[PDB]
Amino acid sequence: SGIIPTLQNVVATVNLSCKLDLKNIALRARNAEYNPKRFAAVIMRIREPKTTALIFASGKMVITGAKSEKSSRMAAQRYAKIIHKLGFNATFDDFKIQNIVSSCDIKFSIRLEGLAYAHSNYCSYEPELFPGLIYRMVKPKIVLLIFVSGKIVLTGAKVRDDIYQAFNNIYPVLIQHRKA
Amino acid sequence: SGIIPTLQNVVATVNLSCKLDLKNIALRARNAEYNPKRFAAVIMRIREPKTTALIFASGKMVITGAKSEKSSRMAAQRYAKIIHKLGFNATFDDFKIQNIVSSCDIKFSIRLEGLAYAHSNYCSYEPELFPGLIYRMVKPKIVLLIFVSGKIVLTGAKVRDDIYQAFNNIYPVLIQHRK
Prior knowledge:
alpha+beta; 180 residues; 2 domains; TBP_dom_sf (chain B); 12 strands; homodimer; nucleus (chain B); TATA-Binding Protein; 26% helix
C-alpha cells in the first residue's frame, strides 16, 4: 500500500452481438457455472491473471477483477475467444470501463471529526452507521472513503487520471487533520 | 427504522460576526470545553434536544446532532443566545444546512453483487475494502449506502425533498435484487 493510489479493481462491460444460452455455456465451459437462483448470469473465471466474467442472457458481459485498463481489455478479449471456441456467434463490441476502485495509505492517522466539520457540505461521517468518512468530490467526480488509519479508498473513476487528480486534491486536506 | 427515510443527523453552519476567545468561552460556559490538542474548536452541548456546537476561532459555528431542519435552526439560535449571555458580541448570520443524513429499512435482504454488476457506472461494491454498496446518484445529488440487510443510508442531502426523491429512485432497483 503506497502513497500513490494503486488500482484494486477495474470493471468493464462489453456487448456480445447475440443472445447466449446460459445453461449451455455453463455445461460446455471448463470454468463457468450457472445457478439462476444464486445469480442471474453465467459466472466464468480465468486463472491468470485472476478475473471474473458475468455473462448475461441479453448478451451483455461484465468483466471484473482486473488491476488495470489494459488487463481488463485483454481479459475481455480472452473471454470472447473462449465463448467463440464454445461455438457461439459473439462479437466484441463497445468495450467500456465503467468503474475503477483504488486505494492508498498516507501512513498517518486522521482526525475524521475535524475533517468532517470543516467540510460538511462535501462529506459525511457517522460511525454509528458506517465506518470512515465519505467525501463526494465534484472535480473530478470521485467518491473517497477516508479512514482513521490513513487508508484511503477512491471509487467511481472512469479513467486513471481522475484517480490521481482526486488524490492530489484531497492530500493537502488530509495533512491538515493529522493526529497521533 | 421505517421504509420512509428518517433523518438521523442534520449539520448546519452559521457565521458569528466576531472573533471569539475560545479558552474564555470554555471557562465561563457551563457545558463547553476547549482542548486544542484534541479538537481545534470549543465544543458546547445542550441537553434537550441533544445537539453539539463546534465554535471556531474564526467565529464560524457548526451545529450538529439535530434531527430536523427546524430543530437545527432552533439549536443554532439557542447557542447564539448562550454565547451572547456570556458577554460576546456575536450575531446570527447566514444560517445554512450543509448536510442531512438519513436511513431506512426495506425489510428484505439485497444481493449486492447483482445490483453492483447491473449498475457498475453508478456504484461500487468491494467488501474487502468497505462494508455495503456505495451508490452515487446524480439526480438528485445523493450518495446512498446499501447494505445486505436491507438497511439504507442516504447522505449528502441539503433539503429533505432530495432524500425522499433519491429513495423513490432507488427503491425499484432494490426490489429487483431481493434475496
